[PDB]
Structure 1
Amino acid sequence: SWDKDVYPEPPRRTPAPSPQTSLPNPITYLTKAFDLLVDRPVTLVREFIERQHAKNKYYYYHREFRRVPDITECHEKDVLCMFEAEMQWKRDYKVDQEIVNIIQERLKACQQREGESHRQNCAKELQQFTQVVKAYQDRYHDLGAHYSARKCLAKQKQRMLAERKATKEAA
């Protein structure tokens, strides 16, 4: 399974079967045949394999990188500090890429799930998508194939000079 907060789903409301006709639908008989002939042997094989897993339990770990100093507090041409800052920046860029991927998965799952009323019922996922794509674009777009933390810092300083000039001229 997964975490139901990073991948949220609304509660499922299925309607009760209310048959109006006297004809038996084939879907219930095929569902019973799928439960007997397919689902129970698959379940028994998986219970066997799960017992064999439980006989020898062992663990793996999610690697925790501590925060090293970033590129702003590295002296110029100091490769030992700015190497670590560059590696930290590359890891954070890869993680931001996967954050955008998570929010896109939420948007697409909402569009399939809400169906024909998807446009009204997926405004929150669309708004989160717009915010995270604006943040990703301000942070990483137009850096080029030879991106670094220096290119990203120069882009941020250009954007902050533009924002400071726009704040100054509007006051």
Structure 2
Amino acid sequence: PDSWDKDVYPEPPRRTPAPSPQTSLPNPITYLTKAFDLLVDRPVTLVREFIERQHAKNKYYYYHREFRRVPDITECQEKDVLCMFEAEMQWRRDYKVDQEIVNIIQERLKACQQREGESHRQNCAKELEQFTQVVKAYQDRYHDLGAHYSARKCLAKQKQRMLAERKAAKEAA
């Protein structure tokens, strides 16, 4: 959480109306807001500075693992386990990553719904549009494989789709 990369997790610019009090009565929320800032915001903010100063004193780093692409199951010889094992572990990693892609595109669709309030049905067409594409791509990739899903079964499903898609194209002509 260095800071949610704004591109990945976007939020539209904030437009807040300025305080325009016409009435003469006092506004309690304004008073409580100041009391909260003094009583809560600052003594806490001081604590976080004391912790943060010591955190920067001892600074050590962790890195994000890099995995070289390796030949896919399409390049593996039949029953050659050492080739299939490399191909199979790689596919599992991507199957796992693609799941977190759908979640990200889901998190957007849920953030837009709340943010746009009562007008959400119009102001979230792009977010709904993106969510339907990722879902369709995911469905074709990984749906129906089963509990014992594998790269060989993912390939077989794809090869079945292409044949039916290929055949269909001919019938049009």
After TM superposition, the score normalised by the length of structure 2 is: 0.98
Separation in 1, partners of 2:165, 2:133: 18
Aligned partner of 2:5 in structure 1 is 3
Cα shift at 1:24:
1.1
Aligned partner of 2:129 in structure 1 is 127
Cα shift at 1:20:
1.1
1:101-158 C-alpha deviation (Å, 9 max, x unpaired) = 0000000000000010001000000000000000000000000000000000000000
Which range moved further: 23-32 or 115-124?
23-32
1:66-99 C-alpha deviation (Å, 9 max, x unpaired) = 1011100000101101101101000000000000
**Matched position secondary structure for 2:116:** helix
Cα shift at 1:25:
1.2
Cα shift at 1:55:
0.7
1:46-69 C-alpha deviation (Å, 9 max, x unpaired) = 000001101100000000111011
1:4-33 C-alpha deviation (Å, 9 max, x unpaired) = 000000000000000011111111111101
Separation in 2, partners of 1:24, 1:92: 58
After TM superposition, the score normalised by the length of structure 1 is: 0.99
The gaps in structure 1 that reach 5 residues or longer are: none
Separation in 1, partners of 2:76, 2:111: 42
**Matched position secondary structure for 2:145:** coil
Aligned partner of 1:87 in structure 2 is 89
Poorly superposed stretches of 4+, deviation over 3 Å: none
Q: Number of matched residues? A: 171
Aligned partner of 1:29 in structure 2 is 31
Q: CA RMSD in A?
A: 0.5
- Percent identical residues: 98
Cα shift at 1:2:
1.4
The gaps in structure 2 that reach 5 residues or longer are: none
